[PDB]
Amino acid sequence: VKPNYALKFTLAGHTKAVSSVKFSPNGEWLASSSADKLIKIWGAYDGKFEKTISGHKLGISDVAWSSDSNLLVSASDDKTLKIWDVSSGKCLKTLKGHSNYVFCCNFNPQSNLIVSGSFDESVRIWDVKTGKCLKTLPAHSDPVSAVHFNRDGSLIVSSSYDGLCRIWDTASGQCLKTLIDDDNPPVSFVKFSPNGKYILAATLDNTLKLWDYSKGKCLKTYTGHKNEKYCIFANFSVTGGKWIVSGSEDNLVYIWNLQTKEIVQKLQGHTDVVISTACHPTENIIASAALENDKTIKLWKSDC
């Protein structure tokens, strides 16, 4: 079994490098963020441009959806996160507290909380309703590259240029685990598996690893792509075959068989680094996005 992703749409409109693309949990929408300070919303199935959401004073590195698909949070170089009402485009809350660029953000499954990671080396936990910062974790000793809640939100995984991946107890802020590796290249990306048992970690030595969280053990390695420079998103594709999906600094989307670790597909089309990829929640649809020689988002669909 191999996928057969084919190009469906190319979405143009951002005026600088695109930073992050995410499908709404209800599958209806794609949100994108960019160095151009804008969020844009697009129909997931027809690629139709819906609206632009603006307000950040500097470039945006990440965006994330609430569980009901009604809210977005964005993380910006302006040191803030913003919570947006997607239907109105209005900024509901500006989340202030970070002392440097906000790099990464996610809601928890209940979506009463938001977690953020910053160049200021901290992880913050925010109350969605009030916009107040509930906890500041002294998480790392370099910029925080990624933050992600597990399946029920009880845990937070973070990664950093300090070479570490740490797991945090959401309720107490306490560190449950630091992943044990003999070496410490920058960790550029981390995410829980959908069942919360595994962690997918990227390092800037062209390497993705699947870690068993309970055992503290590396189970799988995925290679062949280029990743030495940028914090590139990776994914679990679960709708058809069980794949790992990543962007690449050679302008390609890479798809691996999760279990065998074989490259099953490489998607060509982009004309710059593929910084971000996202997997649709119910269909075999990938969204990919690229840096400033390109500035487009591509939507791809497979039979499996």
Binding site: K16, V18, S19, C231
Partner: peptide, 6 residues
């Protein structure tokens, strides 16, 4: 931003 290498 994430679009510049750091």
């Amino acid at each position: 931003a994430r679009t510049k290498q750091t």
